[PDB]
């Protein structure tokens, strides 16, 4: 119960949101590069 209460705090939610936004940025960069490569190949 104590660990669950700590995990559901606003600070932990904000930390997890920041980490997930970083993951989304990495995926967006990967998709950007792959789309550029696909456009280069198809032209």
């Amino acid at each position: 119960a104590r660990a669950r209460d700590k995990r559901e705090s606003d600070s932990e939610r904000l930390k997890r949101t920041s980490q997930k936004v970083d993951l989304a940025l990495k995926q967006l960069g990967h998709i950007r590069e792959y789309e550029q490569r696909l456009k280069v190949l198809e032209r």
């Binding site: 119960a1 660990a3 669950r4 995990r7």
Partner: protein, 228 residues
Amino acid sequence: DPAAVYSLVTRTWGFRAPNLVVSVLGGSGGPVLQTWLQDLLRRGLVRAAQSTGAWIVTGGLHTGIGRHVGVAVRDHQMASTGGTKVVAMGVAPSFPARYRWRNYSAFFLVDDGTHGCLGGENRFRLRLESYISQQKTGVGGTGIDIPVLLLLIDGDEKMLTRIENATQAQLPCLLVAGSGGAADCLAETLKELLTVYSSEDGSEEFETIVLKALVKLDELRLAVAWNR
């Protein structure tokens, strides 16, 4: 008598009554399970049992489908929140105990009567299901009959015989496509109880497939029986 077994399991051992019973069967020999099947076991059956308080009844042996079930349970637990632990009953052929590890709450030991033989327990296991399907869920007799469903992956001729016996006992069975022989081949070949698990279907949709197999009693009563 399966009634005594169920009464001991629920009352004298403190285990809560199940809102769903899922039986894991089959499993071809080999240390390495496919990653697709591993994901199906991890984020599928185990997740649905976690979210509906279901009973995972499977072989308690250290090899075969039981080891895969244990690994999936451990994987879910390590990536789990502060929720209830899944009761995983293992049926295989003094409060303190001594054993060598080199995740199952209960270890049903069936007296086959002959050392070194396997398969004599299966009938007993089926009898237990034939009891727990007829029991009322929730509180009192107002609840619906407890749903019991079998999920088959891989398998052999003995697993086919078990499936036939289960369908004789009005217990629904599901066969996973792409597993290999037995269940997968039978599904490709393809009475009311039998349900086909498409390879397109995967995790995050296990509960809907369970419901559509059970209904084939209504959907709403099953939903209110669970916690979703």
